[PDB]
Amino acid sequence: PQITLWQRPVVTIKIGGQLKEALLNTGADDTVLEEVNLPGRWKPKLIGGIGGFVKVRQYDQVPIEICGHKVIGTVLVGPTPANVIGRNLMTQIGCTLNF
Amino acid sequence: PQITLWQRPVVTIKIGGQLKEALLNTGADDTVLEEVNLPGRWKPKLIGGIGGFVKVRQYDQVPIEICGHKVIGTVLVGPTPANVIGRNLMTQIGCTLNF
Numbered sequence: 001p002q003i004t005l006w007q008r009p010v011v012t013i014k015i016g017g018q019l020k021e022a023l024l025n026t027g028a029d030d031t032v033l034e035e036v037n038l039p040g041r042w043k044p045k046l047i048g049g050i051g052g053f054v055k056v057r058q059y060d061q062v063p064i065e066i067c068g069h070k071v072i073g074t075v076l077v078g079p080t081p082a083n084v085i086g087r088n089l090m091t092q093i094g095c096t097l098n099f
Numbered sequence: 100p101q102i103t104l105w106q107r108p109v110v111t112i113k114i115g116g117q118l119k120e121a122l123l124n125t126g127a128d129d130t131v132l133e134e135v136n137l138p139g140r141w142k143p144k145l146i147g148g149i150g151g152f153v154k155v156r157q158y159d160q161v162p163i164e165i166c167g168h169k170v171i172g173t174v175l176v177g178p179t180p181a182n183v184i185g186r187n188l189m190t191q192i193g194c195t196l197n198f
Contacts, residue, residue: 003196027124097102
């Protein structure tokens with residue numbers, strides 16, 4: 001797909017058998033999701049930093065689908081204004097900026 | 100150009116005869132620049148909002164160049180972690196997301 005930017009680039013992701021919405025965000029280095037009970041081991045990760053950091057859980061090699069594109073990657077799980085797809089997963093789907 | 104997202108999408112903009120760096124940010128609705136003395140009239144604009152808003156100045160139909168692409172648009176001028184190119188100017192250069 002080509003996604004014009006007249007509106008917010010909000011897309012449907014599938015993660016842990018749940019359909020969710022998330023913003024394709026090139027200003028985000030990483031992918032943060034709000035509250036989801038992903039299985040297995042995780043390590044602590046600090047995110048944010050401005051005015052202080054937020055502690056989330058880093059889960060590696062998670063299978064995720066973004067516009068029906070099946071990828072594998074690092075998802076950070078805990079609080080966030082709303083689900084955000086970062087550059088880490090955009091390279092996995094081969095999503096580029098074009099003009 | 101096609102811009103892969105392995106690194107931050109930082110680009111050179113030209114605004115008010117000054118070369119500057121700014122992030123191509125699809126998670127930003129608007130384009131915010133740090134401290135620049137743009138001529139003419141402006142109206143107050145609130146941006147941010149989380150924990151409170153930041154007051155910047157909205158300047159319309161500003162000529163700006165982004166990767167040598169000459170466009171015309173709304174620039175918000177005042178404080179910001181660092182110069183940010185929003186979706187408002189990305190549509191003007193015909194910048195899309197592609198995968």
